[PDB]
Design a protein around this ligand. Structure first.
Ligand SMILES: CC[C@H](C)[C@H](N)C(=O)O
Length: 424
């Protein structure tokens, strides 16, 4: 039976990956990861179940792949390795290895500067191999390979000054930037290269052909780009300053209010990280925060909402978290029965910012356009229109800043993702 026929026969596609939020992550809310979502799509294309294995490290990852009866493929942000014990699919993401340093230290600008530093990379990585190449040229270059850490750990070490430098791909630095406020790109070390899935060595090309056809379909429909934005887009969407500032706020601000968020979350069957995400978007986790628009405190409440909720002080963190949390749940509960989770929460987020009246208008508008008013992706196309006259003059409630409401829901969902992917 071909590699491809065997997968169909078993009704399972076995995938091996790295223990990493970038690749595969287990949370109470389900499974996420750039590679997980991409592979899950592959399995479903083939009409089979996805079964995920995580390796201990990169050497063990490649060793399992060549192992008889092992996984069909590795999906793990791999950079192509002549070792015909392993083969590689077409590439699916353009990334750049980048030398990483700690802000407030001498920035190395060229490979020469890598000499005489404390450097660590993952044992078995293409990054390790790059440094072996440079060592050939510069015989006194020192660095260490480790099989007992992952990429998140290498960046922590640079962040707190445990080591001077590391070397990682630019996608994963972007992803991690929101955890490590001091980490910065020293320079791009080596040129841009594509990530590839790896398959066992040999001449059976039945599954490889399907992987390539699938990845090429993925680039046709923007799937790879959507997945990139979600996991790797943090610095691009929130801006550089937003990225490292969040890392700082996560470190400095959140631990003061984490326990209130959890307590509000438990008593309301609502994920506390979703509540924390709203607090970040509203006030950047600052209890004293006031606007000059009639909203104040950590969850940014109006006086009216504060009183309805039993809040006697909006600048009290605990009370602001409780009232804004109850309020979000209230809004979400009042939504029409027809809106199912997960959309229901994203609708509730929009209503938190714009109110149910304008949100109704966006729902009515989607309906007028032959879209589905209970689907978030549909209504989200309608929200920016509330700010345009050809549209809002035809609405009950008129002009609203719906583009801002879109921004609100995206950011919160991103902050939510970020808080979910935290490791310790
Ligand atoms: C952590 C190193 C990563 C996985 C790199 N792209 C490699 O293939 O080795």
């Amino acid at each position: 039976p071909t590699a491809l026929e065997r997968v169909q026969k078993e009704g399972v596609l076995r995938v091996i990956t790295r223990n990493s939020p970038a690749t595969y992550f287990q949370d109470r809310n389900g499974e996420t990861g750039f590679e997980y979502e991409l592979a899950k799509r592959f399995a479903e294309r083939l009409g089979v179940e996805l079964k995920i294995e995580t390796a201990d490290n990169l050497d063990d990852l490649y060793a399992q792949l060549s192992r008889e009866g092992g996984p069909a493929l590795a999906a793990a942000g791999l950079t192509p390795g002549d070792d015909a014990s392993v083969r590689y699919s077409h590439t699916y993401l353009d990334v750049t290895p980048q030398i990483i340093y700690r802000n407030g230290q001498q920035r190395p600008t060229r490979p020469e500067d890598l000499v005489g530093k404390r450097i660590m990379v993952l044992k078995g990585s293409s990054h390790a191999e790059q440094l072996a190449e440079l060592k050939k040229q510069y015989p006194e270059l020192k660095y260490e390979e480790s099989d007992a850490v992952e990429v998140v750990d290498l960046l922590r070490m640079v962040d707190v000054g445990d080591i001077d430098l590391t070397l990682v791909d630019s996608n994963e630095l972007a992803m991690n930037q929101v955890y490590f406020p001091n980490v910065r790109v020293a320079f791009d070390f080596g040129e841009a290269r594509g990530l590839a899935w790896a398959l066992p060595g040999g001449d059976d090309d039945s599954l490889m052909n399907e992987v390539n056809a699938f990845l090429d379909q993925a680039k046709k429909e923007g799937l790879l780009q959507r997945l990139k934005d979600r996991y790797y887009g943090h610095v691009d969407v929130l801006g550089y300053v937003g990225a490292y500032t969040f890392a700082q706020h996560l470190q400095q601000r959140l631990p003061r209010y984490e326990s209130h968020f959890k307590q509000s979350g438990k008593q309301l069957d609502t994920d506390w990280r979703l509540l924390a995400a709203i607090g970040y978007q509203e006030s950047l986790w600052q209890p004293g925060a006031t606007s000059k628009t009639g909203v104040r405190g950590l969850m940014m409440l109006t006086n009216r909402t504060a009183q309805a909720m039993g809040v006697s002080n909006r600048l009290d963190p605990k009370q602001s978290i409780q009232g804004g949390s109850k309020y979000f749940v209230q809004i979400r509960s009042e939504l029409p029965e027809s809106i199912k989770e997960p959309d229901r929460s994203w609708f509730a987020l929009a209503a938190y910012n714009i109110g149910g009246a304008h949100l109704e208008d966006a729902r009515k508008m989607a309906e007028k356009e032959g879209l589905n008013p209970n689907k978030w992706l549909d209504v989200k196309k309608m929200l920016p229109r509330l700010a345009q006259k050809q549209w809002y003059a035809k609405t009950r409630y008129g002009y609203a800043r719906g583009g801002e409401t879109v921004h609100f829901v995206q950011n919160v969902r991103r902050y939510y993702d970020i808080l979910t992917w935290v490791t310790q």
